């Protein structure tokens, strides 16, 4: 199990409010009071925004995810299908020798 993808996956979707329930809860608490300095939505949504910077830091620091997320799924399937063929040709260049010793 690859690590950095896992703490990404439970750092943007913890096991709840994903990104938008927090922001509409914030603009819902604005509805009680629109006339105060401490009613900036940026203050409490910065926690979600700090989570966004955490996501940026975790995807930038790791380089295997940098190639993991850069290729299309059909590309991944065709490159694993052309990576099984050299292990297959190694299997047959050992089994023909196995035949030749018999």
């Amino acid at each position: 199990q690859n690590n950095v993808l896992n703490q990404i996956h439970q750092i943007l979707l913890p096991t709840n409010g994903e990104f938008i329930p927090h922001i509409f809860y914030s603009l819902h608490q604005i509805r009680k009071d629109p006339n105060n300095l401490s009613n900036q939505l940026e203050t409490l949504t910065g926690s979600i925004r700090h989570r966004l910077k955490l996501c940026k830091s975790l995807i930038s620091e790791n380089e295997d995810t940098k190639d993991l997320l850069s290729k299309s799924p059909s590309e991944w399937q065709d490159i694993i299908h052309q990576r099984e063929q050299e292990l297959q040709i190694k299997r047959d260049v050992l089994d023909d020798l196995y035949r030749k010793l018999q």
Binding site: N16, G17, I20, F24, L27, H28, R31
Partner: protein, 225 residues
């Protein structure tokens, strides 16, 4: 001005995706449009959420273990408590309510938000009892289409949403949703006193019946599916 603009923004923000399956999203989604709600805890593991202002008393049996509701219990305090809230379509006679399907199948609350808005529209403009009017409008339009001697099958509560769906039998033999009719509020003007429409069986005409029962700023309009 300022209040209507922020109301439009909160309306769109709920209209995209109003949170995931949890109790506090349901609580704030029910509170934000003017319905005060009270939460009754059955135990530490199971809870009930109830909304009631004057007539409509909706209750959901949400569980904290399965992340899934159990049953939906809604009781009307009006003069007509036989409101149709189940799905009615051809193929089977299973009678399951829309709110349970919206809360269980879809992981997002958009269908539930639309259903809650429709039930608020039914409740707030109820002495035109919109429950019995919406129930009997399907039968009235079905009898009207029977007089037209053409194949337009009328079914109610399709696509996990309230509404009177009008469908026709196509080539494939399966009923295709082309357009559904329902009661929609007109924000451009609210002074048209909506009548309880009765379709005559003999002279094949619509004759107004409303004389004292009244609804405020509502109309029966068509939208293309």
């Amino acid at each position: 001005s300022y209040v209507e603009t922020l109301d439009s923004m909160i309306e769109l923000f709920k209209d995209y995706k109003p949170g995931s399956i949890t109790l506090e999203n349901i609580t704030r989604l029910c509170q934000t449009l003017g319905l005060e709600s009270f939460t009754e805890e059955l135990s530490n593991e199971l809870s009930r959420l109830s909304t009631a202002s004057k007539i409509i008393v909706i209750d959901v049996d949400y569980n904290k273990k399965q992340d899934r509701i159990q049953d939906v219990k809604l009781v009307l305090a009006s003069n007509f408590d036989n409101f149709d809230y189940f799905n009615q379509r051809d193929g089977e006679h299973e009678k399951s309510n829309i709110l349970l399907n919206s809360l269980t199948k879809y992981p997002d609350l958009k269908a539930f938000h639309n259903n809650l808005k429709f039930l608020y529209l039914l409740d707030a403009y109820s002495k035109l009892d919109l429950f019995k009017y919406f129930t009997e409008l399907s039968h009235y339009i079905r009898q009207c289409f029977q007089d037209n001697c053409c194949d337009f099958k009328v079914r109610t509560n399709l696509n996990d949403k309230f509404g009177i769906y009008i469908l026709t039998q196509g080539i494939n033999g399966k009923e295709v949703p082309l357009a559904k009719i329902y009661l929609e509020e007109n924000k451009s003007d609210s002074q048209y006193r909506f009548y309880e429409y009765i379709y005559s069986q003999e002279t094949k005409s619509w004759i107004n019946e409303s004389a004292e029962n009244f609804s405020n700023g509502i109309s029966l309009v068509m939208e293309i599916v």
